[PDB]
Design a protein around this nucleic acid. Sequence first.
RNA 1: UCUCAUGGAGAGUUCGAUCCUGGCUCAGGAUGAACGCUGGCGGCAUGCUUAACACAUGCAAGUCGGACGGGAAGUGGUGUUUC
Length: 158
Amino acid sequence: GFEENVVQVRRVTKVVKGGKHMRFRAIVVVGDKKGQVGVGVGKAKEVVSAVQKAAVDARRNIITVPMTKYLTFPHRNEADYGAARVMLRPAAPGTGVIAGGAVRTVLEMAGVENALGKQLGSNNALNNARATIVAVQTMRQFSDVARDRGIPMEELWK
RNA sequence: UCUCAUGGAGAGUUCGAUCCUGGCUCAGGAUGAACGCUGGCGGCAUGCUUAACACAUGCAAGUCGGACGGGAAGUGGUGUUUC
Ligand SMILES: [Mg+2]
Ligand SMILES: [Mg+2]
Ligand SMILES: [Mg+2]
Ligand SMILES: [Mg+2]
């Protein structure tokens, strides 16, 4: 139970005999601001019903984002999703969230308050937003590296 | 849980609609600036990017008499002296 925001709304058509069925395509991103990031797509004849379907589809797939004590990424990472490549790096405190439209919301709704990102591929919000999820799933904390490597955290800081 | 990092935002347009590819356009900052409308003061700076085209007028490199000969002025037409 938490809030959501519409990332994009777009009308799609049909070429039936009599005319055209103009129905909406709603992309919705869901985030509690404390991890629990979700991306979903919905489609319906009405605007409101399309947002509801995307909300269920976004809540159908939720993933936590690794963050640090200062609400930043542990390290930089890139990802690709079709023709959509997205870039991410950590940032200093007080820097703020700066990124493209599709990338700002999914990070802004995640909880990270200080980071930066850039998209190097297509301008599609869907293909770019999903790339962010692929980017964050592949990142971890320093502790996860230590247990999977057999070296303490202080020894790696050197 | 250290420290480093003070730094990379996009948007619209091909299609009935979608995902791509690829050009065009915009949001930023700067100027030896110019034009338009408007206009109170102060401080620090700047001011022919074109015809290295042609130029009236005035000035912009003179100085030493303690290097020398002469000359002039003044004075009591005499000494010192000034030019
Ligand atoms: Mg870009
Ligand atoms: Mg059209
Ligand atoms: Mg000149
Ligand atoms: Mg001499």
